[PDB]
Amino acid sequence: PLGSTSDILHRMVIHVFSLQQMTAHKIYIHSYNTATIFHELVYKQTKIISSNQELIYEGRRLVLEPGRLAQHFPKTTEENPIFVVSLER
């Protein structure tokens, strides 16, 4: 209150596809949340532990520094999402 989850005008969406579950996910996130928070939000929907999440964008591994702001992620759409792969095993 306001709180970053209710801060609609500063929120954005990142489109993710989990290959392990074969499920699409919309990651609504504050523009100023970090990659660390992004992974937490992905975990909430996929149960893939943050440090087990490998990200792929346009067929290449995507490496994001922990502090990278959501607003500075690559642009995604439902047709061009960030794929998530698990390092587990």
Q: How was this structure determined?
A: X-ray
- 42, with CB counted inside 10 A (0-12, 13-18, 19+), is buried
How many other C-beta atoms can be found within 10 angstroms of the C-beta atom of residue 38?
24
Q: In angstroms, rounded to a whole number, what is the distance separating the alpha carbons of residues 64 and 7?
A: 24
Strands 82-86 and 11-18: parallel
Whole-Å CA distances, 2 to 6, 9, 10, 13, 39? 6, 11, 12, 19, 23
Top CATH class of 1-89 equals alpha beta
Rounded Cα gap, residues 23 and 80, in angstroms: 14
d(CA 18, CA 49): 13
Distance from C-alpha of 31 to C-alpha of 79, rounded to nearest angstrom: 21
> Beta partners for 27?
14
Q: Would you call 65 exposed, middle or buried from its count of C-beta atoms within 10 A (0-12, 13-18, 19+)?
A: exposed
Fill in the amino acid letter for 5: T
Q: Please state the domain extents for the chain.
A: 1-89
Q: Tell me whether the omega of the peptide bond preceding residue 9 falls within 30 degrees of 0, making it cis.
A: no
